[PDB]
Amino acid sequence: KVFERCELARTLKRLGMDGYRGISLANWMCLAKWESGYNARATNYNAGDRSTDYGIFQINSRYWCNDGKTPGAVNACHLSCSALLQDNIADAVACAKRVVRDPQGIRAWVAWRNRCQNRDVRQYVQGCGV
Ligand code: NA
């Protein structure tokens, strides 16, 4: 499933993402937009280190979920990476909440730094009723 902008915004709000660990909803929308284009089944293989990025927030298999093929990896979210590819994004959200609970916060994703940090991210939630 590929979410539409406002549908995703309302879904994230219902899942308790607005202001989670100081991160506004528009920042989460900006992250999702650049990481996957709001595509819940998106996957990206990183040939360089043999890890794979999964789902709407493109969560990496080295530290967050288990896919069995990533060398010396851990499973901090205690989830199969398969769980991060469902149309129902509850598990991906729970795992993203775990990711930001680390020191770096939202900065854990390089794409956030490149295209969201210090920018006007209001456009991502404008008119969605959130
Ligand atoms: Na892992």
From Swiss-Prot:
Task: Tell me the InterPro entries matching this sequence.
Answer: Glyco_hydro_22 (IPR001916), Glyco_hydro_22_CS (IPR019799), Glyco_hydro_22_lys (IPR000974), Lysozyme-like_dom_sf (IPR023346)
Q: Name the chemical reaction catalysed here.
A: Hydrolysis of (1->4)-beta-linkages between N-acetylmuramic acid and N-acetyl-D-glucosamine residues in a peptidoglycan and between N-acetyl-D-glucosamine residues in chitodextrins
Q: Which one GO biological process term can you cite for this protein? A: killing of cells of another organism
For this UniProt entry, what's an example GO CC term?
A: tertiary granule lumen
- Alphabetically list the UniProt keywords: Amyloid, Amyloidosis, Antimicrobial, Bacteriolytic enzyme, Disease variant, Disulfide bond, Glycosidase, Hydrolase, Secreted, Signal
Disease field? Amyloidosis, hereditary systemic 5: A form of hereditary systemic amyloidosis, a disorder characterized by amyloid deposition in multiple tissues resulting in a wide clinical spectrum. AMYLD5 primarily affects the viscera, and the predominant clinical features are renal dysfunction of varying severity, and intra-abdominal bleeding. Inheritance is autosomal dominant.
Name recorded for this polypeptide: Lysozyme C
Its lineage opens with: Eukaryota, Metazoa, Chordata, Craniata, Vertebrata
